[PDB]
Amino acid sequence: PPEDDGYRKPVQLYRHWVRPKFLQYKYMYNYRTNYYDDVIDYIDKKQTGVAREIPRPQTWAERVLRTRNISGSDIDSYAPAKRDKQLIQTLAASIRTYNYHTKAYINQRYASVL
């Protein structure tokens, strides 16, 4: 249908007025920063003396995983809690190991006949 179209039509909707700016959206900024993050990281830690291999180019999915690694990890990090809670009862059992002990074996007699 849009073959004999030429241009993309003049201005419309003059009287009502629409189109507030909507100037910024977050993930677009994330993508823009993503396209340069690896190279800027490489260079600015290069002046610090720490070494890294060449910034191999990354694909879009690779870029998104990179972004999640640099952003999702920062916003989502709750590793320590359940581990120590689970270790709590193991330690409690470790104290509880007394259980009156005693009896046992390889412990009998006093004879010196060898």
Residue numbers in the entry: 69 to 182
What are the paper's exact sentences on this?
Striated muscle thick filaments are composed of myosin II and several non-myosin proteins which define the filament length and modify its function. Myosin II has a globular N-terminal motor domain comprising its catalytic and actin-binding activities and a long α-helical, coiled tail that forms the dense filament backbone. Improved resolution for the non-myosin proteins resolves the entire length of flightin within the annulus of myosin tails, resolves the ambiguity for one unassigned density, and improves the shape of the stretchin-klp densities on the surface of the filament backbone.
Studies of the flightin amino acid sequences from many species identified a highly conserved domain in the middle of the sequence, residues W85-R131 in Drosophila, dubbed the “WYR” domain due to its enrichment in tryptophan, tyrosine, and arginine. Application of the structure prediction program AlphaFold to the Drosophila flightin sequence produced a structure for the WYR domain that was an excellent fit to the central density. The WYR domain-predicted structure consists of a pair of α-helices connected by a loop. To obtain the final model, we removed the N-terminal residues P69-K95 from the AlphaFold model and rebuilt them de novo in COOT. In addition, the residues G140-L182 were also rebuilt de novo to fit the density. The atomic model begins at residue P69 leaving 68 N-terminal residues disordered. The myosin mutation E1554K prevents incorporation of flightin into Drosophila flight muscle thick filaments. The Drosophila flightin atomic model places flightin residue R87 in position to form a salt bridge with E1554. The second region of interaction contains a salt bridge between myosin residue E1557 with flightin loop-1 residue R124.
